């Protein structure tokens, strides 16, 4: 078990409701693995009031 672990580098909080997140490094095949799960949960699982 010799994994790799990122520190969160830079957040470009331009406005509040808009943002950019960088992250580096990972192991290979992990920029696909995490962010596909992360795009899913941030589309379809939150609270809400409408």
């Amino acid at each position: 078990t010799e994994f790799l672990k990122p520190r969160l580098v830079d957040i470009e909080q331009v406005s509040s409701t808009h943002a950019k997140v960088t992250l580096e490094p990972l192991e290979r095949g992990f920029g696909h693995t995490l962010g596909n799960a992360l795009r899913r949960i941030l589309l379809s699982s939150m609270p809400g009031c409408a």
Binding site: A37, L38, I41, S45
Partner: peptide, 13 residues
Amino acid sequence: ATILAEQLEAFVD
């Protein structure tokens, strides 16, 4: 990201 930790909690045990 905390809920993805919450859904794996059957497997830290």
